CSV table of C-alpha atoms in Angstrom, one decimal:
chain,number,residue,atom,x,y,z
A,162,UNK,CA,45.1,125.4,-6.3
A,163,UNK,CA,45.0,124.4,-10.2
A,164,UNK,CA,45.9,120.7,-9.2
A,165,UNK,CA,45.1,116.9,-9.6
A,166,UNK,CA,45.5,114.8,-6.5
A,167,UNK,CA,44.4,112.3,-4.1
A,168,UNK,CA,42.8,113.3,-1.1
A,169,UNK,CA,44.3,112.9,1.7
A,170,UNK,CA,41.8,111.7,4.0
A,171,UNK,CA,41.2,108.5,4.8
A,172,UNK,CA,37.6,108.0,2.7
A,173,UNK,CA,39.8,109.7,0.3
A,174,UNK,CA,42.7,108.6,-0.5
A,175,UNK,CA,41.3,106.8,-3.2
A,176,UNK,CA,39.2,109.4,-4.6
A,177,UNK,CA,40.9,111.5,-7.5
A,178,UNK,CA,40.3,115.3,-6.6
A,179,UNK,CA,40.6,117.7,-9.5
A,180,UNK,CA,40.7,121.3,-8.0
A,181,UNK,CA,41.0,124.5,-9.5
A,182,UNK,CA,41.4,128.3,-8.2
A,183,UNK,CA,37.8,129.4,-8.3
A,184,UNK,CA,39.5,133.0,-7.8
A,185,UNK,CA,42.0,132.3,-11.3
A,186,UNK,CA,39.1,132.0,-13.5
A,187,UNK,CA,39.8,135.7,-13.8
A,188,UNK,CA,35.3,135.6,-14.2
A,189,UNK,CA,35.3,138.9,-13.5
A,190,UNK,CA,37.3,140.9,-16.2
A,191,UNK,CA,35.0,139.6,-17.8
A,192,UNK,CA,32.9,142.6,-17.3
A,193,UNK,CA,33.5,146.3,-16.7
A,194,UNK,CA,33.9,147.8,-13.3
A,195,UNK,CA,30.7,149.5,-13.9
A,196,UNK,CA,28.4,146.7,-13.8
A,197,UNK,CA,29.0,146.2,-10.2
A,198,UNK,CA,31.5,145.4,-7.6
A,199,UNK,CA,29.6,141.9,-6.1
A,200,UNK,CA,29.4,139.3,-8.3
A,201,UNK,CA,28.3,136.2,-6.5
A,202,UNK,CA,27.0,132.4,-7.6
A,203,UNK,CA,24.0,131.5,-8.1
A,204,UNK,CA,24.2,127.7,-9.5
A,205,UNK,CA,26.7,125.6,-10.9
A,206,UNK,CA,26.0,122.7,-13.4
A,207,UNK,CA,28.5,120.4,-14.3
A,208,UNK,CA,29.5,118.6,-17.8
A,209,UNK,CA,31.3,115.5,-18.3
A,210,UNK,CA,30.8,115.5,-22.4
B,42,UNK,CA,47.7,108.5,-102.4
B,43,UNK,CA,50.9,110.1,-103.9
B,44,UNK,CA,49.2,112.6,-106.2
B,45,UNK,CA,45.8,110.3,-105.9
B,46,UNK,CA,43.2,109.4,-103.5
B,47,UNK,CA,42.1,105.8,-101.1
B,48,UNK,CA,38.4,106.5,-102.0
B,49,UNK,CA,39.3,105.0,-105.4
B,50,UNK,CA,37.1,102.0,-106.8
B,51,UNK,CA,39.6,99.5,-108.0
B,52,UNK,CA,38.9,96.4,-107.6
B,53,UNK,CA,36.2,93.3,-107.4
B,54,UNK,CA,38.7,91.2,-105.5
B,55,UNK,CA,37.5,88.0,-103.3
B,56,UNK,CA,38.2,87.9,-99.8
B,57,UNK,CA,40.4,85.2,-97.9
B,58,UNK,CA,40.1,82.5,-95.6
B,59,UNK,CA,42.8,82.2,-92.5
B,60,UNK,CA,44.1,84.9,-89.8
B,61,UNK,CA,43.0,84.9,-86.2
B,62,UNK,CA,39.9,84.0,-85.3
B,63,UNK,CA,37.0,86.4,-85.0
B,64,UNK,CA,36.1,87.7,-81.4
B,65,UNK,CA,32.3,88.4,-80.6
B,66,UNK,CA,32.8,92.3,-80.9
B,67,UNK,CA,34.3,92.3,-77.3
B,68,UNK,CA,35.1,96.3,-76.2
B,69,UNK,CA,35.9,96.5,-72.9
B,70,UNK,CA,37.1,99.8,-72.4
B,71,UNK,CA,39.2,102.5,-70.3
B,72,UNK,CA,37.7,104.3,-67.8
B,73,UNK,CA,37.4,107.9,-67.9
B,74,UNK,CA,37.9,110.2,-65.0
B,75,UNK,CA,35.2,108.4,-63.1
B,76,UNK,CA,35.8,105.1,-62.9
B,77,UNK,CA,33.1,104.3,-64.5
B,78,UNK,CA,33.4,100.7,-65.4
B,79,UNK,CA,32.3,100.0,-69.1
B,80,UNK,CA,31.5,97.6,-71.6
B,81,UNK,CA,30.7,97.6,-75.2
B,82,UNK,CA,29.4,95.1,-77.5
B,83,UNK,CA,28.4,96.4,-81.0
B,84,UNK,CA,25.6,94.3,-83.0
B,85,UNK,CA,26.4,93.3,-86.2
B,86,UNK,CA,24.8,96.1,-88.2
B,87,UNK,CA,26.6,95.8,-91.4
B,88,UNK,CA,23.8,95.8,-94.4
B,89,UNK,CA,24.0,99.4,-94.7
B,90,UNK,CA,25.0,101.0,-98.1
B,91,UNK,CA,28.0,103.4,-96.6
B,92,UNK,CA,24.8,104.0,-94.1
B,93,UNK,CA,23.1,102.2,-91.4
B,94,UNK,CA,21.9,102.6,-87.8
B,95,UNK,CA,25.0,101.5,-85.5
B,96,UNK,CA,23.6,100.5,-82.2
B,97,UNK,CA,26.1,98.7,-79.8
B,98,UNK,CA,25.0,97.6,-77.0
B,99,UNK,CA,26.9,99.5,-73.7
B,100,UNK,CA,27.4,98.4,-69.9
B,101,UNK,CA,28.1,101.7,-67.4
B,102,UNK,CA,28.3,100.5,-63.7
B,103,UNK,CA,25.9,101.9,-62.2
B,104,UNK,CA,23.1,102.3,-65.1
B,105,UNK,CA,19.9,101.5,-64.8
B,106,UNK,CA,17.9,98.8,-66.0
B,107,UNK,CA,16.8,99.6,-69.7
B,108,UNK,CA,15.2,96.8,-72.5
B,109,UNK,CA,18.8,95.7,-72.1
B,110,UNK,CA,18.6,95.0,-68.7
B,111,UNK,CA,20.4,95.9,-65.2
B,112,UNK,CA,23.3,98.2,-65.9
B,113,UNK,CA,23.1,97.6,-70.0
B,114,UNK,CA,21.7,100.4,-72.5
B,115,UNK,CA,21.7,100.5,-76.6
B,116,UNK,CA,21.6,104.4,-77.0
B,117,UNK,CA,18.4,104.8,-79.1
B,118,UNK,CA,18.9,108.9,-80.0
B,119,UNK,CA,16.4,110.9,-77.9
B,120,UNK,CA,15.4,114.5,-77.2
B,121,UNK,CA,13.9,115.1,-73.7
B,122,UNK,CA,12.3,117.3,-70.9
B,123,UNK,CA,14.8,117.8,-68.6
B,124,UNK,CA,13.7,116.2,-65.4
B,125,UNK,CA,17.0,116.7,-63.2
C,3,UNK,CA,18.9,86.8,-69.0
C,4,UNK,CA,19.1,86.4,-65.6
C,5,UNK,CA,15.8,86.5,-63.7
C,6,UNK,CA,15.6,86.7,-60.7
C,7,UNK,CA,13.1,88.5,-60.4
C,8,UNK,CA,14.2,91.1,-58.2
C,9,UNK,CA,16.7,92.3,-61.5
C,10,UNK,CA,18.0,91.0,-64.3
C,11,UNK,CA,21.1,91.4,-66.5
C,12,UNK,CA,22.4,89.8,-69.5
C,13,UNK,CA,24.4,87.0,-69.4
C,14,UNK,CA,25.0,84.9,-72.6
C,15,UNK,CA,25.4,86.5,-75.8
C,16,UNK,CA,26.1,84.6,-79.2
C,17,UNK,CA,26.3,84.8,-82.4
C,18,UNK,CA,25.2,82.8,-84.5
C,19,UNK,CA,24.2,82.5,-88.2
C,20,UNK,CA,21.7,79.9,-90.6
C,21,UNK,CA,23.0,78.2,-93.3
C,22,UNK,CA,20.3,78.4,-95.8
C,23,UNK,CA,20.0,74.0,-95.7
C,24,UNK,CA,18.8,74.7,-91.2
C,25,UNK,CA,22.5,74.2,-89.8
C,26,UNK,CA,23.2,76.0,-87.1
C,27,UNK,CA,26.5,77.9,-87.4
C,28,UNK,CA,27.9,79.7,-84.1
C,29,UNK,CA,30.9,81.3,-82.3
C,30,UNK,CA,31.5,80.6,-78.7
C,31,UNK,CA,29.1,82.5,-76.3
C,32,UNK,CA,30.4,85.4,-74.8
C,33,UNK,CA,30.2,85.1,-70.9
C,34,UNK,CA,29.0,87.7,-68.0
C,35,UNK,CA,29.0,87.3,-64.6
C,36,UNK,CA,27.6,90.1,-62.0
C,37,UNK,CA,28.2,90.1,-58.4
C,38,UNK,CA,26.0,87.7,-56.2
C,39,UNK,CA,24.1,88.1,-53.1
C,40,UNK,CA,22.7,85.8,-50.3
C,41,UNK,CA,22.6,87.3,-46.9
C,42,UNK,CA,21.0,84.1,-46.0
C,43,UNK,CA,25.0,82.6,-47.0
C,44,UNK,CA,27.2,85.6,-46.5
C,45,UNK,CA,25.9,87.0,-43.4
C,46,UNK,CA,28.2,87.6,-40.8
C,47,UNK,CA,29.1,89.3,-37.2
C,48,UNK,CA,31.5,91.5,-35.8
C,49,UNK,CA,31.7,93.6,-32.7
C,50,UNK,CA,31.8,97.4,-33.0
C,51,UNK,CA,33.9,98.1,-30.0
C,52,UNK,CA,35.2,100.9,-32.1
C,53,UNK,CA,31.6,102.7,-31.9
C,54,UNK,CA,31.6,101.7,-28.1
C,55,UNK,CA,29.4,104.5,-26.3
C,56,UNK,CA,27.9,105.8,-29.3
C,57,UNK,CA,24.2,105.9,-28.5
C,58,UNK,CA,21.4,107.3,-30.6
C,59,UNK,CA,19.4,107.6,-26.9
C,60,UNK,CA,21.6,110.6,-26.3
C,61,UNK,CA,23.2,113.7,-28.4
C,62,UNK,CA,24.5,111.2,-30.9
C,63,UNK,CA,24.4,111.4,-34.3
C,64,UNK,CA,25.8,109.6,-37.6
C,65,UNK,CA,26.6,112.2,-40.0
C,66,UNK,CA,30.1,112.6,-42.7
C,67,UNK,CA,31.5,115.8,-41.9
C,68,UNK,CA,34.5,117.3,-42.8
C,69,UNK,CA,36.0,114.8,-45.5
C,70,UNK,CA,32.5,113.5,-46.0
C,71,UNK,CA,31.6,110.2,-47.5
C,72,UNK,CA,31.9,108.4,-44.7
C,73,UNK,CA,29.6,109.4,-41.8
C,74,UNK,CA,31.7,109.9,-38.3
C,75,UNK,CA,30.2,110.0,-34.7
C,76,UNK,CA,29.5,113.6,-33.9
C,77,UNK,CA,27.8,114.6,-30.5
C,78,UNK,CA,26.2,117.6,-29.5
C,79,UNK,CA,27.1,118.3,-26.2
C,80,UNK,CA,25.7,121.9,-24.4
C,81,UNK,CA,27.5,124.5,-26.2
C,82,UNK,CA,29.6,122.3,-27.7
C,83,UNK,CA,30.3,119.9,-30.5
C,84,UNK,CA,32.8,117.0,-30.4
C,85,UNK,CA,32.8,114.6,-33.7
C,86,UNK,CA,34.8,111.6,-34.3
């Protein structure tokens, strides 16, 4: 799940998909246990620099 | 000198004609570390009686324009507020 | 002298001396030159593909950073810097 491919549907084949593991960020150890157990989105922005 | 000295008065001689031909006083001269291009060119100051002012005229790239113009200064000796 | 108007510099120097009869008695004039300018002869044009998607408009900024004396392209992205 930390890959670069082509879709593979048809409107996709063309289209470059860069995916990542959302779970591998490792966010969470981030911050101690005590903090709380549910960490959940709330908005994501993206960069192309 | 053996056992004398060269500030001895000895003679009235004449000078000669012949040699190389005199330059105009050119000095171009060696950088230092600074590259700073330079030229000197000394006026004939020569009345003086073992005295006399000795003003040359001096070109530093990058000097500004004094009574000698762009890049050219004569060094009159000055004392000054420090305006840095 | 040279003027221009804009700036001048000195360009002919000689020496020269008066025989005491009015004869004019001279070494060879000592040449300068200083370097010219005439955008309206020397302009000229050249692509900067090498700056391609630099843009003021943006985070984008001329400044000589690290090595100085030459300013680079550095950009200010969010939480980040990148320079070129």
């Amino acid at each position: 799940n930390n890959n670069l491919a082509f879709g593979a549907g048809t409107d996709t084949k063309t289209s470059l998909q860069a995916s990542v593991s959302f779970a591998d960020l490792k966010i969470r150890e981030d911050y101690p246990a005590s903090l709380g157990k549910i960490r959940r989105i709330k908005q994501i922005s993206v960069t192309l620099p | 000198m053996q056992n004398s000295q060269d500030f001895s008065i000895t003679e009235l001689s004449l000078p000669k004609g012949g040699g190389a031909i005199t330059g105009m006083g050119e000095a171009l001269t060696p950088t230092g570390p600074d590259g700073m291009a330079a030229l000197s060119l000394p006026l004939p100051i020569s009345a003086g009686r073992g005295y006399a002012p000795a003003f040359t005229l001096n070109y530093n790239s990058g000097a500004g324009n004094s009574p000698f113009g762009l890049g050219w200064d004569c060094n009159v000796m000055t004392i000054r507020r420090r305006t840095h | 002298y040279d003027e221009s108007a804009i700036a001048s510099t000195l360009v002919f120097v000689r020496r020269v001396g008066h025989e005491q009869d009015g004869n004019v008695v001279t070494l060879p004039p000592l040449e300068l030159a200083y370097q010219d300018f005439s955008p309206r002869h020397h302009a000229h044009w050249q692509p900067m593909d090498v700056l391609a998607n630099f843009n003021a408009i943006q985070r984008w900024q001329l400044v000589d950073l690290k090595g100085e004396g030459l300013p680079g392209l550095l950009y200010q992205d969010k939480g980040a810097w990148w320079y070129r």
